[PDB]
Protein backbone atom coordinates (compact mmCIF):
# COMPACT_ATOMS: atom_id res chain seq x y z
CA UNK A 1 0.00 0.00 0.00
CA UNK A 2 1.34 3.43 -0.92
CA UNK A 3 0.32 7.02 -1.56
CA UNK A 4 2.31 9.84 -3.17
CA UNK A 5 2.26 13.64 -3.23
CA UNK A 6 3.67 15.80 -6.04
CA UNK A 7 4.54 19.50 -6.07
CA UNK A 8 5.01 21.45 -9.30
CA UNK A 9 5.90 25.00 -10.36
CA UNK A 10 6.30 26.20 -13.94
CA UNK A 11 5.91 29.14 -16.26
CA UNK A 12 5.62 28.93 -20.05
CA UNK A 13 5.62 31.63 -22.71
CA UNK A 14 4.54 31.72 -26.36
CA UNK A 15 5.14 34.65 -28.73
CA UNK A 16 2.80 35.18 -31.69
CA UNK A 17 3.65 36.87 -35.00
CA UNK A 18 1.65 37.72 -38.12
CA UNK A 19 1.71 40.22 -41.00
CA UNK A 20 0.90 43.09 -38.62
CA UNK A 21 -0.07 41.26 -35.37
CA UNK A 22 2.80 40.78 -32.90
CA UNK A 23 2.38 39.69 -29.29
CA UNK A 24 4.23 37.67 -26.69
CA UNK A 25 2.28 36.02 -23.87
CA UNK A 26 3.34 34.53 -20.53
CA UNK A 27 1.72 32.37 -17.85
CA UNK A 28 2.23 31.10 -14.31
CA UNK A 29 0.75 28.41 -12.10
CA UNK A 30 1.31 25.52 -9.73
CA UNK A 31 -0.12 22.00 -9.50
CA UNK A 32 -0.41 19.44 -6.71
CA UNK A 33 -1.19 15.72 -6.66
CA UNK A 34 -2.45 13.09 -4.21
CA UNK A 35 -2.28 9.40 -5.15
CA UNK A 36 -3.48 6.28 -3.31
CA UNK A 37 -2.38 2.83 -4.49
CA UNK A 38 -2.64 -0.76 -3.25
CA UNK A 39 -1.27 -4.00 -4.66
CA UNK A 40 -2.05 -7.64 -3.85
CA UNK A 41 0.20 -10.53 -4.90
CA UNK A 42 -0.22 -14.28 -5.27
CA UNK A 43 2.76 -16.49 -6.01
CA UNK A 44 3.80 -20.09 -6.53
CA UNK A 45 7.23 -21.72 -6.89
CA UNK A 46 7.91 -25.45 -7.25
CA UNK A 47 11.61 -26.34 -7.10
CA UNK A 48 13.16 -29.76 -7.61
CA UNK A 49 16.80 -30.68 -7.14
Amino acid sequence: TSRTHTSEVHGNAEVHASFFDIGGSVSAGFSNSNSSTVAIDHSLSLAGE
Partner: protein, 49 residues
Protein backbone atom coordinates in the same frame (compact mmCIF):
# COMPACT_ATOMS: atom_id res chain seq x y z
CA UNK B 1 81.15 -71.58 21.01
CA UNK B 2 83.02 -70.73 24.22
CA UNK B 3 86.00 -68.89 22.78
CA UNK B 4 89.48 -70.47 23.13
CA UNK B 5 90.91 -67.91 25.57
CA UNK B 6 88.12 -68.84 27.98
CA UNK B 7 88.97 -72.53 27.97
CA UNK B 8 91.28 -71.81 30.93
CA UNK B 9 89.86 -72.37 34.44
CA UNK B 10 90.82 -68.83 35.49
CA UNK B 11 89.30 -66.87 32.59
CA UNK B 12 85.58 -66.19 32.81
CA UNK B 13 83.25 -67.03 29.92
CA UNK B 14 80.30 -64.65 29.67
CA UNK B 15 78.44 -62.69 26.98
CA UNK B 16 78.45 -58.94 26.40
CA UNK B 17 75.31 -58.18 24.38
CA UNK B 18 74.58 -54.67 23.11
CA UNK B 19 71.81 -53.35 20.85
CA UNK B 20 72.39 -50.60 18.32
CA UNK B 21 69.82 -48.68 16.31
CA UNK B 22 70.37 -48.44 12.57
CA UNK B 23 67.30 -46.58 11.33
CA UNK B 24 64.25 -44.88 12.80
CA UNK B 25 61.02 -44.80 10.80
CA UNK B 26 58.24 -42.51 11.99
CA UNK B 27 54.88 -42.59 10.23
CA UNK B 28 52.55 -39.67 10.92
CA UNK B 29 49.11 -41.02 11.77
CA UNK B 30 46.71 -38.68 10.00
CA UNK B 31 43.54 -39.28 8.01
CA UNK B 32 42.58 -37.17 5.02
CA UNK B 33 39.49 -37.20 2.86
CA UNK B 34 38.34 -35.53 -0.35
CA UNK B 35 34.81 -34.98 -1.61
CA UNK B 36 33.37 -34.04 -5.00
CA UNK B 37 29.73 -33.19 -5.59
CA UNK B 38 27.55 -31.50 -8.19
CA UNK B 39 23.85 -30.72 -8.26
CA UNK B 40 21.17 -29.30 -10.54
CA UNK B 41 17.86 -27.61 -9.76
CA UNK B 42 14.79 -26.33 -11.58
CA UNK B 43 12.25 -23.84 -10.26
CA UNK B 44 9.12 -22.76 -12.15
CA UNK B 45 7.74 -19.61 -10.53
CA UNK B 46 4.15 -18.90 -11.58
CA UNK B 47 3.27 -15.52 -10.12
CA UNK B 48 0.30 -13.15 -10.20
CA UNK B 49 0.22 -9.42 -9.37
Amino acid sequence: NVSPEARHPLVAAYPIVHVDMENIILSKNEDQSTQNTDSQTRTISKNTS
